[PDB]
Amino acid sequence: TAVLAALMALLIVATVLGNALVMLAFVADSSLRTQNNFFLLNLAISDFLVGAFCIPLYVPYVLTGRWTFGRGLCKLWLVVDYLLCTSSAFNIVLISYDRFLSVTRAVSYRAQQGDTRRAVRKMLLVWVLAFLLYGPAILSWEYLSGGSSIPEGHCYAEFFYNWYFLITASTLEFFTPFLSVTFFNLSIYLNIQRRTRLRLDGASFTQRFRLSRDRKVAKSLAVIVSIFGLCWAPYTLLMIIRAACHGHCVPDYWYETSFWLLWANSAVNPVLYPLCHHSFRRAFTKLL
Amino acid sequence: TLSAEDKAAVERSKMIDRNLREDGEKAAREVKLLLLGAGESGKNTIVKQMKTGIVETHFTFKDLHFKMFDVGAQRSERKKWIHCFEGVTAIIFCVALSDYDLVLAEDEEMNRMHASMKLFDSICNNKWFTDTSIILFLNKKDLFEEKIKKSPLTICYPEYAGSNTYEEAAAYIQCQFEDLNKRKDTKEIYTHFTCSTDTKNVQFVFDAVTDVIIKNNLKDCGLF
Amino acid sequence: SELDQLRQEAEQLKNQIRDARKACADATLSQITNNIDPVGRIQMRTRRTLRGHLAKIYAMHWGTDSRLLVSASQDGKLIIWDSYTTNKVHAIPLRSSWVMTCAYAPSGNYVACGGLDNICSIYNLKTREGNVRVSRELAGHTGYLSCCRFLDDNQIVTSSGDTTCALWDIETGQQTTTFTGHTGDVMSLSLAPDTRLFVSGACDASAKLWDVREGMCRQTFTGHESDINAICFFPNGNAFATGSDDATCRLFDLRADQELMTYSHDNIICGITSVSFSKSGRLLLAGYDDFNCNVWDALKADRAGVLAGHDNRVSCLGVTDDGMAVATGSWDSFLKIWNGSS
Amino acid sequence: TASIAQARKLVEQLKMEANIDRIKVSKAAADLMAYCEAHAKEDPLLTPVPASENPFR
Amino acid sequence: VQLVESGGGLVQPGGSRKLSCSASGFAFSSFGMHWVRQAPEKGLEWVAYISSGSGTIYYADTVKGRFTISRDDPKNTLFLQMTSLRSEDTAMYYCVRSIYYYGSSPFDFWGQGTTLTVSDIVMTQATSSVPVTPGESVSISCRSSKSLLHSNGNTYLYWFLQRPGQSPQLLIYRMSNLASGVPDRFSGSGSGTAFTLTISRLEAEDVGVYYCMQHLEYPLTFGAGTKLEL
Ligand SMILES: CC(C)CCC[C@@H](C)[C@H]1CC[C@H]2[C@@H]3CC=C4C[C@@H](O)CC[C@]4(C)[C@H]3CC[C@]12C
Ligand SMILES: CC(C)CCC[C@@H](C)[C@H]1CC[C@H]2[C@@H]3CC=C4C[C@@H](O)CC[C@]4(C)[C@H]3CC[C@]12C
Ligand SMILES: CC(C)CCC[C@@H](C)[C@H]1CC[C@H]2[C@@H]3CC=C4C[C@@H](O)CC[C@]4(C)[C@H]3CC[C@]12C
Ligand SMILES: CC(C)CCC[C@@H](C)[C@H]1CC[C@H]2[C@@H]3CC=C4C[C@@H](O)CC[C@]4(C)[C@H]3CC[C@]12C
Ligand SMILES: CC(C)CCC[C@@H](C)[C@H]1CC[C@H]2[C@@H]3CC=C4C[C@@H](O)CC[C@]4(C)[C@H]3CC[C@]12C
Ligand SMILES: NCCc1c[nH]cn1
C-alpha cells in the first residue's frame, strides 16, 4: 500500500520541479524569446499544472476509493484535467509543426522567429481550443441530458461510458494529433536525408560527422513519435473499447494503469523537448 | 495617471516599436555574406557575377535577398572590427588557383597560395566565426589548367606526391584548404571551382546558404 | 649615418622623460589615500531596461539634461530614449548599419554616429519638418570611425582606425585640424570639461593628450600592455583613466605626466570596453568582456561593487551630468539604468 | 628619405614633451583626493539619494 | 510647412459638409492633428483631435456624434466630416499640427483656416482689452479653475497670438518655454492656477489677441482672449 503512495508522490515531485525548471529558466534567460521557446514554455506550464493540481487532488480518489471533495469540486477537476491533458497534446503538434516550418519554409522561419506576438497568438489558440473540446461537454452534459448517472462518491466524466462521443472527441484529441506528429516528424527526416544526399554528391571527418548527426536526429524523431503514442494510445483505445462493453470486457486494474500513462507523459515531456533543445540547456547551466 | 501629452508620447513610442519590429523582420529575411580574400584573387570578378570604407552589394536569387560586404578597403586592424560581422550567414572566401606558383609582390619571397592559406586559417579558426560556415571559391581555374602544363604543383607544395593532371592538382589544393579547418563539427566548408565564364556561382551560393540556414533552424528548433 | 644618429637621440630623449617622471614620483597615490575610509559596498539596481534594439549595442551617450540618451546598434538604428519613462523619442535609420560610435550634442539639437563606413554623420533633431534628417556627412578618414564628441553645434572631434584624430567644422564639412602621432588604430577619445584638450587611446597601448586649438600632442602616456579601448577624463580635468585589453584600468595624471594607480583583479582576465567616472570622481565604472560592470574606488583601487545585469559584453557605459544614474549598453541588445538606494 | 623625415619629426616631438613642468605625485594625489572630498555629498552614485529625490524610482 | 484648408462655405441648417486640410513641407504622418474653430467676434474653441497613426481620436462634447475626423497619410490630407450642422457651428475652422514627445512644441503651426457659415477646465482672461503703447512692457493674466501643474513637473499652459487677419501662432508652450521663431522679449511666468505673459518692449507686430490654452486633459479649453490695442 505504501509503495503506491510513494510512486504517486514521486510522480508529483518529478512533474512539478521538472516543469518548474523550464519555466524558471525561461524567466532567467532573456534570449529565450523565439516562437519555439515560447511553445516549449506552454508545454511546460500545461504539464506543471497537471502535477500541481490534477495529480495531488486525485490521490484521495485512489487511496480511499471514493471522491470526498464534493460534486461541485468534481466538475472543476474534470474540466481542468481534460483541459491540461488536451493542451499537452496540442502543444506537441504545435512544436512539431514549428519544426516542420524550420525545414520547409526555412527562410521565412528564421525571419518570423523571435516575434513574440505570433507566439502568444498560437499559445492562446492552443488553450482555447483545448478547453472547447471537453470543457463545455463536461459541464453541460448533466443539465441537458436530464439527470446524472454518476453514483455518489465517484468523480468521472458524464460521457465515461458513452461510445459515440469518446471516439469523436479522441479523434480531435489523439488520432489527428498523432498522425500530424508522425507526418511532421517524417517529412523532417526525409528532407534531412535528401539534403545530405545532394551535399555528398556535390562535394572526410566533416562528412562522417554530418551523417552521424542525422542518425542522432533520426533516433530523436522516433522517440518523440513513440513516446507520445505509447502514453496516449492505450488509454484512448481503452475508453472506446470499455464504453461498448460497459467495463465487462476490460479489467478494472487495466483502466487505472492506462489512466496514469497520460500523466506519465507530462513528466517525460520536460526530458524530451526542453532538455534536448540547444538553447534551453545553456539556460539550465546558468541557473545550475 | 499620465497626462494628456504623456499618453500621446507613450503612443508615439508604440508607433516606433511597431516600425522597429517591421524593420527587424525585413532585415531578418536578408542573407548577410562576408566577402574575404587576397588581392588579384577573383574577388572583384565574383561580385560582377553576383551582380571609402565597407562596400555592400545587394542581389536577389530565387526570392532570397543577399547582402554581401567587402572589407578589402579597411587597412586598419582586423581584430578591432571583425566581431562586427559575427552572426553573418556565411563567409565567402576567394582564392586564385593560378597564383600557386606566383610570389607575393610585397614580400618578394612568399608564395601567393601560402598567403591565402594564412588568411584562410585565421578567418576559419577565428573565435568570432566558430559556427559560421565558409563558402570557398577557387577562381582562375582555366588559367590554373594552363599553368599546370608549364609549371607543376611541386613549386607550391614541395611535399606533393600526386600527378600533374588538372583533376588531381585541383583536388589536392581543395583538400589543403579544408584541412586547415579545426572546427569540423561546428562548421562546414563549401568549395566551388569558378571561372570568368561561369554562371552557376550564384546557384552554388544559394544552395550553400540554404543548407546553412536549415542547419541553423534545426539548431534553433532543438533537433540539432 | 644620419638616420642611425637621430634614432639614438630619441632613445636619449625617452630616458630623459622617464628620469623626469621618476624624479617627481616621490610618493604613490595608494600611500596618500590609505588613511581615508573606504566607500563601502556600492549596490545599484536596474531601474530601467531599454528594449527595442535588435542587435549588438555598440555605443551610448547621455544628453546634458541627464534625461535623454542616444544609443547606437548594428541593426542600423539610432534610438533616442526618454530614460525617465523609457519612451522612445526618436528612431533614426542609419544609411550604414556598421555603426561603432555615437555622440549627443551638448545643446541637444544634434546627434552623430559612424563606423566602418569611415563617415561621421550629423543628424538634426530640431527641424521644422518634424523628422530627423542628416545635416552633414564628414568624409576624410581612411579608417573606421571609433569615437566622436561634440565641442559645440559646429565643432566635433573624431578618432579613426587610420591612426589619426580630426577636428571638424560641421558647417563647412572640412576637418580644420588633424591630430597625428598614434602608430595604431585610435579606439576612443575623451574631451576635457573646458573642451580645450582631449585625450585619445590607441592600439599602440599609449594615450596622447592633444591641444584642440594648437593642434599638437602635448604629452604621451604609456604603461598599458595591450590596445586601449576606453578613456575618460577625471571630472576636474587634471587626470584621466584608460581601459585596455590587458584587464587593467590605469589612472594617469596630466600635471605629474605619469600613471598614478592601476585597477585590476586576479579574477579579471577579460578586456575592458568602457570607462567612466562618477560625478565626484570617487568611483570608476568599467565595462568588461565578462558581461559585468565593475565599480572601482578611484582613490584606493578597491572594487566597490559589480553591476551584473547583461548576458553579453558590456560594450558601453556612461554617467549622467548630474551624477544620478549610470547607463550600460551591451551586445545582448539591452540598455539598463542603475543607481543605488538609501 | 621617408625614414629620415619621420625620424626628425619624432625627435622634435620628444623635445616638446621633455620640456614640460611636472609636479610631484604627492601634490597631484592630494588634488585628486581634495576634489573627491569636496564633491562627495553631491554624488548620487556614491551616496544614494532618498527615493523621493530619485528620478528613476 | 503649409496647411491649406478647403471645403468651407455657406450651408443649410441640418446639412453636411466635408472639410479638407492638405499638408505639405513636413512629415504629416508624424504629427497629431487638431481642428480648432473660432466663431465670428469670439474666441478659439477646440473641435477634435486625431493622433499620429489614427489610434486615438477625441471630440468636444458640443460636436461629438455629429463630426467625424479622419486623415489620409499617403495623401497628407486631414478630414473633418460634419453632419446635422447647426447655426452654432458657424466659425472659421483651423487645421493645427501637434507632435508629442519629450521636449516637443505642440500646436506650433496653424493653417490659414476655412470659413463655414450655417443659415472641463475653465480658463479665464477677465481683461478683455488692454490699451498699450510701443516700447512699453505689458502683462497679460490667465486663470484656471484647476491646477495645470501635473505631478511630472510640467504645467500644461499654452499662449497663442492671433494678429488681425492672421492665424494664431504659438508663443509659449508649457507655461515657460519660448516657441521657435518667437522673439525673446516674450516671457511666460506662472504658478499653480495663475499665469502671466509678459511682453517687454512692445512693438507694432505684437498687437493682437492673446489666448491661453490648457493641455492638461481633454477637452482642450481656451481663455476668452485679451486684446492689445494702440
Ligand atoms: C515516477 C514513476 C514511478 C511513476 C510511475 C507511474 C505508474 C507506473 C504508477 C504510479 C501510480 C501507480 C498506480 C497507483 C494506483 C493504482 C490503482 C490500483 O488499483 C492498481 C495499481 C495502480 C494502477 C498503480 C499502478 C502503477 C502506477 C500507475
Ligand atoms: C491554477 C493556475 C491559475 C495557477 C497559476 C499557473 C499560471 C497562471 C502561472 C504559473 C507559472 C506562471 C508563468 C511563469 C513564467 C512566466 C514567464 C514570464 O516571462 C511571463 C509570465 C509567465 C508566463 C508566467 C505566467 C503565469 C503562470 C503560467
Ligand atoms: C480558456 C480556458 C483557460 C478558460 C477556462 C475557464 C474555466 C477555468 C472556468 C470557466 C467556467 C468555470 C466553471 C463554471 C461552472 C462550474 C460548475 C460549478 O458547479 C463548479 C465550478 C465550475 C466547474 C467552474 C469551474 C471553472 C471554470 C470551468
Ligand atoms: C486551470 C485553468 C485556469 C488554467 C488556465 C491556463 C491559462 C489561462 C494560462 C496558463 C498559461 C498562461 C499563458 C502562459 C504564457 C503566456 C505568455 C505571455 O507573454 C502572455 C500570457 C500567456 C499567453 C499566458 C496566458 C494565460 C495562460 C494560457
Ligand atoms: C475542435 C478542435 C479543438 C479540434 C482540432 C484539434 C487540432 C486539429 C487543432 C487544435 C490546435 C490547432 C493548432 C493550433 C495552432 C496552430 C498554429 C498555426 O500557425 C498553424 C495551425 C496550428 C498548428 C493548429 C493546427 C490544428 C490544431 C492542432
Ligand atoms: N482525457 C484525458 C483524461 C486523463 C487520462 N489520464 C489522466 N487524465
CATH numbers and ranges of domains, chain A: 2-287 (1.20.1070.10)
Subunit contact C128:E180, Cβ cutoff 8 A:
yes
Give A-chain residues touching B29 at CB under 8 angstroms: 107-108, 110-111
List the residue whose alpha carbon is closest to atom 3 of ligand 4: A80
CA distances from A166 to A132, A139, A232, A236, B48 (A): 15, 16, 14, 8, 65
Backbone phi, psi, residue C57, to 5° = -80, 130
Q: Please name the residues in contact with A44: beta carbons below 8 A apart, sequence gap of 6 or more.
A: A19, A22, A23, A26, A269, A270, A274
Subunit contact C82:E27, Cβ cutoff 8 A:
no
Structural domains counted in chain E: 2
C-alpha radius of gyration, chain E, whole number: 17
Q: Residue E219 corresponds to which amino acid?
A: P
E179 in a domain, yes or no? Answer: yes
CA distances from E11 to E8, E14, E17, E65 (A): 9, 9, 8, 19
- Is residue A47 in contact with ligand 6, taking CB distance under 6 Å? no
A214 touches chain C (CB under 8 A): no
Residue E111 and residue E137 in one domain = no
E213 in a domain, yes or no? Answer: yes
Taking the centre of ligand 1 as the mean of its atom positions, its distance from the CA of residue A236, in whole angstroms, is 18
Backbone phi, psi, residue B62, to 5° = 60, 60
* Residue E196 grid coordinates: 502671466
Domain boundary among the residues E71, E92, E118 is at E118
For residue E32, the number of C-alpha atoms closer than 13 Å in the C-beta half-sphere is 25
Contact C158, C143 (CB under 8 A): no
Cross-strand bridge partners of residue C70: C61, C80
Residue A45 C-alpha from the chain's centroid: 11
Which class does domain B30-205 fall in? Answer: alpha beta
- Is residue A129 in contact with ligand 2, taking CB distance under 6 Å? no
B54 closest CA partner among B38, B39, B67: B67
DSSP string, E112-170: --EEEEE--PPEE----EEE--TTS-EEEEEEESS--B-TTS-B-EEEEEE-TTS--EE
Contact C282, C240 (CB under 8 A): no
Contact C281, C299 (CB under 8 A): no
Q: Residue A223 corresponds to which amino acid?
A: V
* Residue C15 grid coordinates: 630616458
C-alpha radius of gyration, chain C, whole number: 20
A32 closest CA partner among B131, B87, B220: B220
How big is chain E, counted in residues?
A: 230
DSSP string, A156-198: --TTSS-SHHHHHHHIIIIIHHHHHHHHHHHHHHHHHHHHHHH
B190 closest CA partner among B139, B141, B134: B134
Give C-chain residues touching E30 at CB under 8 angstroms: 130-131
CA distances from A219 to A232, A264, B224 (A): 20, 21, 12
- Is residue A81 in contact with ligand 6, taking CB distance under 6 Å? yes
Assign residue E103 a region (left: φ > 0; alpha: ψ between -120 and 50; beta: otherwise): left
Residue E106 and residue E7 in one domain = yes
Return the residue matching grid coordinates 556561382: B201
Q: Residue C90 corresponds to which amino acid?
A: H
- Which residue range(s) make up the domain with C325? 2-339
- Is residue A45 in contact with ligand 4, taking CB distance under 6 Å? yes
At C63, which CATH number?
2.130.10.10
* Eight-class DSSP state of E205: T
Q: What is the distance between the alpha carbons of residues A37 and B73, in angstroms, rounded to a whole number?
A: 41
Provide the shortest C-alpha distance from residue C158 to chain D (in Å).
22
* Residue E63 grid coordinates: 460636436
Nearest chain A residue to C332, by CA: A31
- Is residue A262 in contact with ligand 6, taking CB distance under 6 Å? yes
Subunit contact E52:B15, Cβ cutoff 8 A:
yes
Please give the number of the atom of ligand 4 that sits closest to the Cα of A127. 28
**Tally of CB atoms within 10 A around E115:** 15
- Measured in angstroms, the resolution is 2.7
Backbone phi, psi, residue B143, to 5° = -70, -35
The answer to whether the Cα torsion of A134, A139, A144, A147 is positive or negative is positive
**Tally of CB atoms within 10 A around B72:** 14
Q: What is the distance between the alpha carbons of residues A74 and A214, in angstroms, rounded to a whole number?
A: 48
- Chain C stretch 167-206, residues whose beta carbon is closer than 8 A to a beta carbon of chain D: 181
- Which residue range(s) make up the domain with E170? 123-223
Contact A34, B220 (CB under 8 A): yes
At E68, which CATH number?
2.60.40.10
Contact C63, C294 (CB under 8 A): no
Q: What is the distance between the alpha carbons of residues E199 and E193, in angstroms, rounded to a whole number?
A: 20
Q: What is the distance between the alpha carbons of residues C236 and C278, in angstroms, rounded to a whole number?
A: 12
Q: What is the distance between the alpha carbons of residues C259 and C252, in angstroms, rounded to a whole number?
A: 4
B218 closest CA partner among C309, A278, A266: A278
Return the residue matching grid coordinates 528548433: B221
Give B-chain residues touching E152 at CB under 8 angstroms: 3, 6
E228 in a domain, yes or no? Answer: no
Could you please state the CATH topology (level 3) that the domain comprising D4-56 is classified under: G Protein Gi Gamma 2 (4.10.260)
Q: What is the distance between the alpha carbons of residues B167 and B163, in angstroms, rounded to a whole number?
A: 9
Burial of B125 (0-12, 13-18, 19+ CB in 10 A): middle
Which stretches of C147-270 are DSSP H helices? none
Subunit contact C75:B75, Cβ cutoff 8 A:
no
* Residue A37 grid coordinates: 521557446
Residue C13 C-alpha from the chain's centroid: 30
- Is residue A218 in contact with ligand 4, taking CB distance under 6 Å? no
Burial of B167 (0-12, 13-18, 19+ CB in 10 A): exposed
E146 in a domain, yes or no? Answer: yes
Residue E113 and residue E138 in one domain = no
Give C-chain residues touching E25 at CB under 8 angstroms: 128-129
Q: What SS3 state is found at C149?
A: strand
| Mutation site, A97, A100, A102, interface B, largest B CB count within 10 A | A102
- Judge if the upstream peptide bond of residue A136 is cis by omega within 30 degrees of 0: no
Q: What is the distance between the alpha carbons of residues A123 and A111, in angstroms, rounded to a whole number?
A: 19
C-alpha radius of gyration, chain D, whole number: 23
Burial of A234 (0-12, 13-18, 19+ CB in 10 A): middle
Domain locations in chain D? 4-56
Strands, E assignment, E43-106: 44-50, 57-59, 67-72, 77-82, 91-98
List the residue whose alpha carbon is closest to atom 19 of ligand 2: A27
Contact B5, E156 (CB under 8 A): yes
* Residue C6 grid coordinates: 637621430
Q: What is the distance between the alpha carbons of residues B138 and B192, in angstroms, rounded to a whole number?
A: 6
CA distances from C139 to A255, C96, C134, C172 (A): 80, 14, 14, 12
Subunit contact C325:D44, Cβ cutoff 8 A:
yes
Subunit contact C14:D14, Cβ cutoff 8 A:
yes
Give B-chain residues touching A100 at CB under 8 angstroms: none
- Chain B stretch 60-119, residues whose beta carbon is closer than 8 A to a beta carbon of chain C: 71, 74-77, 80-81, 84
* Eight-class DSSP state of A123: H
Residue E23 and residue E112 in one domain = yes
Structural domains counted in chain C: 1
E230 in a domain, yes or no? Answer: no
* Eight-class DSSP state of B102: -
Q: What is the distance between the alpha carbons of residues A28 and C24, in angstroms, rounded to a whole number?
A: 52
Nearest chain D residue to C218, by CA: D17
Nearest chain B residue to C53, by CA: B20
Q: Please name the residues in contact with C24: beta carbons below 8 A apart, sequence gap of 6 or more.
A: C256, C257, C258, D22, D23, D24, D25
Residue E159 C-alpha from the chain's centroid: 9
Subunit contact B5:E51, Cβ cutoff 8 A:
no
Q: What SS3 state is found at C292?
A: coil
